[PDB]
């Protein structure tokens, strides 16, 4: 009926506390936040 | 996997059985189906019962006799102009109008649309003889 | 920039349609069903001499069923027709 | 899709001039022959309900092959074979029937009798015809019934800016 | 397109018939179902 709510952290987890990491995924555009809104999305699903 | 899910479907509710769902199996009242093997996929020769030649008749809700209003326990009350009959709704076939194919329910002054016409009684002619 | 491409037939075929315009094909004001789709209701066809034609494509045959609060309509023959039906 | 759910009538049925279906009112439903575009109240509001434009990168919407009005076309040939037919439209020729008939054919569908119609005749009709007002008043007043269509719009009008939106960065 | 089937499926089994199916149409014993165009969609009137 429904499956494991994980979700994920992608600059956490493309750069951990690095902020140089941070700023070259920052130039890479908004792939990061395209992901997240994935991942809940999934979630709401999963409840609903 | 969604197409070879309705096609598990549709075998197992035309094939395994007759399937009441309208438009699932072939178009019209579904009879029967048959599968036939085809290369990454599945054929069903849907067997269905399609009414071919239609007739207008004048038709009424109920039929008031003996100050009783009586409905027809299956079918339809049809008229071809003189006289009423009963019929099955998805083949022509008028019936007498007796008490065996109607049940009474109640008087006449409120079904809208009731006509006069007698229902023959199948035991009278037996009372008298 | 060559003629070869670009062909008018006097202005005629030119035809201005939601999804763009139409180029080389022929307006028609009758309609039949779609043969290929161009985009909002407009349909081309190869149709008799014979060029290619675009209608707006017919949805079906009107029909008014003759509704009565008094009469029915009541089949006395039937047809039993087999369906094909195929799956992936 | 669009083809599949709308056409699975297949002549076009045309609703009978006088609507003289034994109390039940399908005004709501039917088309309004008064505006433009036939279509019906209930229709006026559900179109009403749903809500950069000039996208020059590369992008751009195809109309569907199907219009607007040919869709309430569609809609209003189903709502004819049903209130003029029945069920026995999609099932072949369409057989005509009185309306309260039909509906006493679906009340012995439900395992009630025609017994229980043919006296609650006007009491069932009116109930329709209020069920039929509140929904019109619910369609207009309640902002978010159209909760799935406005979702789906607003998920492809968001792809579609983080797209346009995506030329911005420099990788 | 799964909702598409399942509007194709539910104008077929309640527009032009009676479906016995519990909940398919409707919240109760279902009796009929109108279509109504809508902007990317469709919307049942479901009697019951
Ligand atoms: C029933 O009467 C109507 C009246 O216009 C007519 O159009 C229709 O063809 C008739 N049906 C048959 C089967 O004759
Ligand atoms: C109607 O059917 C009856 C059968 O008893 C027949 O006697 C009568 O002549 C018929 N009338 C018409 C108009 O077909
Ligand atoms: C049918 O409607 C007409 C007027 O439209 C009316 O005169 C007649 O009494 C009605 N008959 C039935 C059976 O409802
Ligand atoms: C049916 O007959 C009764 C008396 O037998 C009469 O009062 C009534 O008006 C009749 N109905 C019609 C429609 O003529
Ligand atoms: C539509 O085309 C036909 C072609 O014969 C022509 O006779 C008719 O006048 C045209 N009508 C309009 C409104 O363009
Ligand atoms: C029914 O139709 C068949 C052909 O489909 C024909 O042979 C037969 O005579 C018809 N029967 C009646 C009663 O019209
Ligand atoms: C049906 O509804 C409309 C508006 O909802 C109303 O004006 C009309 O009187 C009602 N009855 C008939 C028979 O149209």
Not at chain 2, 13 to 26: I, N
Not at chain 2, 55 to 73: L, Q, S, Y
Not at chain 2, 101 to 127: K, M
Not at chain 4, 21 to 33: A, E, Y
């Amino acid at each position: 009926v429904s499956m494991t709510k994980t979700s994920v952290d992608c600059t956490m987890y493309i750069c951990g506390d690095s902020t140089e990491c941070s700023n070259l995924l920052l130039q890479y555009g908004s792939f990061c936040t395209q992901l997240n809104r994935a991942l809940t999305g999934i979630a709401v699903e999963q409840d609903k | 996997r969604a197409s070879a899910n309705l096609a598990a479907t549709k075998m197992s509710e035309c094939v395994l059985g007759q399937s009441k769902r309208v438009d699932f199996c072939g178009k019209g009242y579904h009879l029967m189906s048959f599968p036939q093997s085809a290369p990454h996929g599945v054929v069903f020769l849907h067997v269905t019962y399609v009414p071919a030649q239609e007739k207008n008749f004048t038709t009424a809700p109920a039929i008031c006799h003996d100050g009783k209003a009586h409905f027809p326990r299956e079918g339809v009350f049809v008229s071809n102009g003189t006289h009423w009959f009963v019929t099955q709704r998805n083949f022509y076939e008028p019936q007498i109008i007796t008490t065996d194919n109607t049940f009474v329910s109640g008087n006449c002054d409120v079904v809208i649309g009731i006509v006069n016409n007698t229902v023959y009684d199948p035991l009278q002619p037996e009372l008298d003889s | 920039l060559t003629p070869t491409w670009r062909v008018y037939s006097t202005g005629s075929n030119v035809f201005q349609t939601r999804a763009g315009c139409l180029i080389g094909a022929e307006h028609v004001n009758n309609s039949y069903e779609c043969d290929i789709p161009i985009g909002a209701g407009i349909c081309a066809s190869y149709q008799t001499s014979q060029s290619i034609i675009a209608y707006t494509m017919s949805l079906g045959a009107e029909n008014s069923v003759a509704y009565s609060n008094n009469s029915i309509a009541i089949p006395t023959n039937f047809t039993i027709s087999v369906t094909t039906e195929i799956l992936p | 899709n669009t083809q599949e759910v709308f056409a699975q009538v297949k002549q076009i049925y045309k609703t009978p001039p006088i609507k003289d279906f034994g109390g039940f009112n399908f005004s709501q439903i039917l088309p309004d022959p008064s505006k433009p575009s036939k279509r019906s109240p209930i229709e006026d509001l559900l179109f009403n309900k749903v809500t950069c434009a000039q996208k020059f990168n590369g992008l751009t919407v195809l109309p569907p092959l199907l219009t607007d009005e040919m869709i309430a076309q569609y809609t209003s040939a189903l709502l004819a074979g049903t209130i003029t037919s029945g069920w026995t439209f999609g099932a072949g020729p369409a057989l005509q029937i009185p309306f309260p008939m039909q509906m006493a054919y679906r009340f012995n569908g439900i395992g009630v009798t025609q017994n229980v119609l043919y006296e609650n005749q006007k009491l069932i009709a009116n109930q329709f015809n209020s069920a039929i007002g509140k929904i019109q008043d619910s369609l207009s007043s309640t902002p978010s019934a159209l909760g799935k269509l406005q979702d789906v719009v607003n998920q492809n009008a968001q792809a579609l800016n983080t797209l346009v939106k995506q030329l911005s960065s420099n990788f």
